[PDB]
Paper text:
NaR belongs to the microbial rhodopsin family, whose members are widespread in the microbial world. After starting the photocycle, NaR captures Na+ from CP medium and then releases it to the extracellular (EC) medium.
We herein solved the structure of a NaR from the bacterium Indibacter alkaliphilus (hereafter, this NaR is abbreviated as IaNaR) and then found unique features in one protomer of the asymmetric dimer. In molecule B, the three-residue cluster at the EC surface is disrupted, and in the vicinity of the PSB, the Arg108 sidechain lacks the interaction with Asp250 and is oriented toward the EC side. These differences from molecule A seem to be related to the large outward bending of the F' helix caused by unnatural interprotomer interactions. The EC end of this F' helix forms a hydrophobic interaction with the A helix (the first helix) from molecule B of the neighboring asymmetric unit. For IaNaR, the corresponding Asp115 is also oriented downward in both protomers, while the distances to the Schiff base nitrogen are somewhat longer (3.9 Å and 3.4 Å for molecules A and B, respectively). Thus, we assumed that molecule B mimics the Na+-releasing intermediate and then proposed a working hypothesis for the mechanism leading to the swing motion of the Arg sidechain.
Author numbering:
A (entry chain A): 8 to 269
B (entry chain B): 6 to 270
Amino acid sequence: TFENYIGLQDGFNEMAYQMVAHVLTLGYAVMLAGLFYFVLTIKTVAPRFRTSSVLSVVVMVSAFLLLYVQASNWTESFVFDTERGKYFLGEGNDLFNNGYRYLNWLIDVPMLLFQILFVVTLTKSNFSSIRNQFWISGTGMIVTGYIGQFYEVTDLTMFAIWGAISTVFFFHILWLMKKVIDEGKDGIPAKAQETLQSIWVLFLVSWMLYPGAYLMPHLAGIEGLFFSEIGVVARQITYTIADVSSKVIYGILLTNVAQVMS
Amino acid sequence: NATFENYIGLQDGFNEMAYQMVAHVLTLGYAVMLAGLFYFVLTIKTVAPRFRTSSVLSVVVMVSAFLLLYVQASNWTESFVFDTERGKYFLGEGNDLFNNGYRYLNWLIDVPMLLFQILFVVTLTKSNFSSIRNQFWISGTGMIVTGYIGQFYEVTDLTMFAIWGAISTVFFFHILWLMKKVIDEGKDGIPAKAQETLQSIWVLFLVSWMLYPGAYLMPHLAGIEGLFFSEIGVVARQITYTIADVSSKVIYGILLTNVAQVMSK
Ligand SMILES: *C/C=C(C)/C=C/C=C(C)/C=C/C1=C(C)CCCC1(C)C
Ligand SMILES: *C/C=C(C)/C=C/C=C(C)/C=C/C1=C(C)CCCC1(C)C
């Protein structure tokens, strides 16, 4: 409950509050933009690759609704105070919770992991085990990382152990994902492999922003510059930077591969 | 292995009346979506800011429903070729009507939005907003996904048709149970006029959403399939789907603004 500590203790200034709102807003705006693209490029690809576009489409709705709800929740959860000149947390149900983002990833991560297996062929690996290990590891990554965030402020020590258990589940993801890229690369045109490598480095970078934002409150030391409203701002841009990269750009690039393969 | 509309269009064919009635009801469909879009943009100012998230969601539902119902109308016109020997329309050139993908893509997109938006209007006393949303999404998505999968076996494998269709009804009965809770809970504490509208919303939700399995699963469940395995059944199902979409999207969103307008006073 990092945002609710800052939101109630220090408060949010007008710039910070309206930035998180605006960033989240264009976040769900580009989600619907990416959805428009994936529907249009469904007959651009062969029937074999149309499962990937649907997975992109399904991912687009869920990210939009998440970014949509979190944008609405952010607008309503913090009420302006006239005497102090800041926005403070207030009472209701349906308050802004960054853990809702986690539960979204619980289902979005496997889809984003699966849909490349529908684009990319597996050589010297069976589709079942790869997909099956993707599922358990990514799910195991998110659930324990979900747990650690509960101790983001009250217990930094549990925040450490739980958040570290998941980052090896992360390292599992990258260790199963690399061969998917590798084995699927050779055999198809080299330009599609170059795309696929860009898809890998993009994969690498964007998926580090999610533990990187998980480390925003305690980056400039435990309670430094980022244990403030700017650390709350910084976290929500980062997520929005990651979400476009991890989903829209990632799916757009998986389609180019599917288009190149006809 | 074959869609109901594909089999009829490839084997039996379509006489002029049936062929033009499907396009007619499809064009009427997106016309109602475009007209509903006018209402929602025009009413966005009639509610307090906290309820414009629901109105804009309706706008989003209208745009995508309009666009996707539009492509279906265009595809229906372009996918069939007239045969002068039979006086009928036959799907040609390996046109599969996209396996009704645009129809199911439309449902895949709109269903979560339709379920999500009522939480932006209605206030909850006992339930966890995030968990309701997650369940809504899981059930709604699985329903349409399993509906699209089983739709390929309606003419071929009755066993596979039943196993996927029965799975879609699991998700469906779960949605009904959820939507009933949200509405019954959101009635507490609000003016009785919005309570009455919320009940009309429930009844409308119940009936309209029921029309989709009615046109797909209930013909086989009652043994009336076979009488509809023709061009008549293709038209009857499309008309039912279109009436259901107007009710579940446009009429649904209108009543939501009426609740938000009462609570915005
Ligand atoms: C569309 C959403 C995406 C791709 C989410 C990705 C999630 C992760 C790579 C983040 C996992 C975490 C860690 C590696 C460290 C501990 C906490 C987490 C869950 C943020
Ligand atoms: C606006 C889009 C809507 C409301 C469409 C929703 C679809 C359903 C409520 C129906 C789903 C189905 C079943 C319950 C059983 C058989 C398979 C379906 C997809 C027709």
